[PDB]
Each structure stands twice: as structure tokens, then as C-alpha cells.
Amino acid sequence: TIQNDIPDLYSVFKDYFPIGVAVDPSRLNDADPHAQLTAKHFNMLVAENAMKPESLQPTEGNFTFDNADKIVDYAIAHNMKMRGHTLLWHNQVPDWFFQDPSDPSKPASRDLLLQRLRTHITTVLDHFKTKYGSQNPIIGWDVVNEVLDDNGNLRNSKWLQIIGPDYIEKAFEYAHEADPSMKLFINDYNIENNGVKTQAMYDLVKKLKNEGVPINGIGMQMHISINSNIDNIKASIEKLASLGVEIQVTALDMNMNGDVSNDALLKQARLYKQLFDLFKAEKQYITAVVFWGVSDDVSWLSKPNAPLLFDSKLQAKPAYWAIV
Numbered sequence: 373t374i375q376n377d378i379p380d381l382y383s384v385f386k387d388y389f390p391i392g393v394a395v396d397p398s399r400l401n402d403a404d405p406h407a408q409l410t411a412k413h414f415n416m417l418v419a420e421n422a423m424k425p426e427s428l429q430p431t432e433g434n435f436t437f438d439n440a441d442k443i444v445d446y447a448i449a450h451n452m453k454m455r456g457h458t459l460l461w462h463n464q465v466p467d468w469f470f471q472d473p474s475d476p477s478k479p480a481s482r483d484l485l486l487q488r489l490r491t492h493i494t495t496v497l498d499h500f501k502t503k504y505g506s507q508n509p510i511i512g513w514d515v516v517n518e519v520l521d522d523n524g525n526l527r528n529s530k531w532l533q534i535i536g537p538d539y540i541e542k543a544f545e546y547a548h549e550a551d552p553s554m555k556l557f558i559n560d561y562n563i564e565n566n567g568v569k570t571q572a573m574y575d576l577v578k579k580l581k582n583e584g585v586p587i588n589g590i591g592m593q594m595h596i597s598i599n600s601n602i603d604n605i606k607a608s609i610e611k612l613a614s615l616g617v618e619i620q621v622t623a624l625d626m627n628m629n630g631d632v633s634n635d636a637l638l639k640q641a642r643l644y645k646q647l648f649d650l651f652k653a654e655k656q657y658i659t660a661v662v663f664w665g666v667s668d669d670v671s672w673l674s675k676p677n678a679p680l681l682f683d684s685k686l687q688a689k690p691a692y693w694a695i696v
């Protein structure tokens with residue numbers, strides 16, 4: 373059962389940015405406490421999995437939007453905005469995209485993969501626009517996800533292998549043409565550490581924007597840990613923000629490295645407070661902060677963990693109180 377009378381989390385940040393959460397379509401019924409926590413605390417929603425490539429086009433031409441639409445319907449019912457995650461990724465993407473259809477032992481050509489990417493992107497954006505029109509809650513999409521490797525080079529996924537480095541620009545071009553009202557984001561992890569990957573993201577977006585690619589923002593996943601350095605996060609936000617693009621914290625959670633002790637929860641509270649003070653200070657750049665999961669019991673991190681503001685019993689943790 374949830375605490376109904378404590379402050380609605382997002383309301384604390386109404387003069388800063390929307391506070392969202394990634395959800396599962398099976399946790400949206402009125403009588404479900406996870407759904408109750410969702411509607412109470414967040415004014416933005418993201419599909420944890422239902423809008424990924426495999427979730428939307430499992431086999432070629434066979435689009436499965438029911439779960440995604442259920443989440444959209446819920447967002448509309450609760451006056452929430454949404455982020456669309458994600459049009460291209462190297463995980464949770466069906467193998468068929470990359471296969472020659474006449475000979476599945478061989479790879480698709482650059483032209484075929486680009487056409488499939490265009491058809492997927494266009495169908496996905498046209499689906500939400502035609503089904504929901506002006507009520508579509510999605511304000512932007514993670515057009516590409518995790519396209520850098522951890523050394524800052526372009527990740528050598530099948531997209532890069534078959535098409536070449538311009539596949540990124542093409543994804544943005546296709547998305548922009550399908551729905552110019554959508555804000556387009558490039559999303560990634562570890563770019564908050566002010567290391568080689570942060571520099572690589574800055575370099576890549578600088579290059580693509582100067583070439584006219586319609587990139588509107590950079591999504592920083594923010595899968596941080598109990599040991600993360602706030603100074604590095606601040607430096608990363610400043611560097612990326614200098615490009616004149618929006619910054620969104622897209623998948624926030626805190627890896628506790630197996631220590632879920634009460635002492636660790638207090639340390640987590642101090643770190644989350646510093647993190648949100650930083651986000652507030654950077655409100656001129658940050659346009660959304662989204663948690664990757666509603667409560668600890670449904671976090672994607674392996675156990676044991678305690679990554680979020682609500683615990684495995686759906687109760688507000690010390691970090692929640694520290695922030696509000």
C-alpha cells in the first residue's frame with residue numbers, strides 16, 4: 373500500500389522540470405499499488421520496454437503497438453507527458469533487420485537496412501501521430517541509444533557494420549521527416565563521468581549538428597552508483613550543454629553495489645540530494661529527469677539493490693525525504 377498523504381514528488385520540481393518514470397504495461401491498473409505510486413509522483417512517463425524495436429516490430433511488417441498504446445492511454449488519463457524510448461539500439465532489436473531476407477545466413481545491404489530503419493521509424497512516429505493526434509503525450513524520442521562504446525569510438529553494432537558511420541545521421545533525418553514536432557535525442561550511459569565517453573558524445577554531437585543533423589538534445593541515462601562523483605556529473609552537463617542542445621536525465625537510478633544497509637540508505641540520501649541540487653542549478657539546460665523504475669522491487673538492476681526513491685515495499689526512502 374502506498375503513502376497517499378506525502379508530497380507528490382514531481383510537484384516539488386514544478387519550477388524546474390517534469391519528473392518522470394519508466395514503467396511496465398502490467399503495472400498500470402488503478403488497483404495496483406505500483407500504478408498508484410506512478411500516478412501520484414510523476415508527471416512524465418517512459419516505456420521501460422514497450423517501445424523498443426523488438427517490442428514494436430517483432431517480425432517484418434508485423435507491428436505490435438498494444439502495450440505501447442496502453443502506456444500512452446494511461447499517460448493521457450493522468451495528464452502526463454512522455455518520452456519515446458527508443459527508435460534504434462543494438463539490444464532488443466530483432467535479428468531480421470540485419471538479415472538478407474532471401475538468405476538469412478547473409479547480412480542485409482546498406483540500402484536495405486536503411487530502408488528498414490526508415491520504415492520502422494516512420495511507422496512508429498506515424499502510428500502515434502495518427503492514433504492520438506494532438507493528444508499524443510510523447511514530446512520527444514531517443515532516436516538512437518548507446519551508439520558510442522566505452523572508449524568513445526562508435527559502437528561496432530550491426531548498424532555500424534552494415535551501413536557505416538552515417539547511420540546515426542540517417543536515423544535523425546528519418547525521424548525528423550516523419551514528425552517534425554518531436555524533440556530528437558541521442559541517449560547514452562557513462563557520459564556523466566567526464567571521461568573519454570563524455571568527450572566523445574560532445575565531439576559527435578558537435579560534428580553532426582554542424583552538418584545540419586536535426587539533433588535537439590542529449591539524453592544522459594544516469595545509471596550512477598553510490599560512489600559517483602558529483603563534480604564529474606556537473607562538468608559533464610556543462611560540457612554537453614555548451615552545444616546548445618537540451619539535456620534530459622533519462623534513466624536515473626543508483627547502484628548500491630550490494631550494500632543495502634541502513635547506513636548505505638543514508639549515504640544514498642545525501643548523494644541524491646546533491647544530485648538534485650545540481651539538476652536544479654542546471655535548470656537552464658535540463659528539461660526532464662526520469663527515474664528508471666517505479667520502486668526498488670521492480671528495478672532492472674540485479675539483487676540485492678535499493679536504487680530508487682521508493683523501496684521494495686513501495687515506501688518513501690530517506691532519499692525521497694532528502695529531496696523534497
Ligand SMILES: O[C@@H]1[C@@H](O)[C@H](O[C@@H]2CO[C@H](O)[C@H](O)[C@H]2O)OC[C@H]1O
Nearest residue numbers: 420421517559561593595623664672
Ligand atoms: O527491463 C530491462 C530494462 O529496464 C532495460 O532498460 C535499459 C536500461 O539501460 C538503459 O537505460 C537503456 O537505455 C534501457 O533501455 O533494458 C533491458 C530490460 O530487460
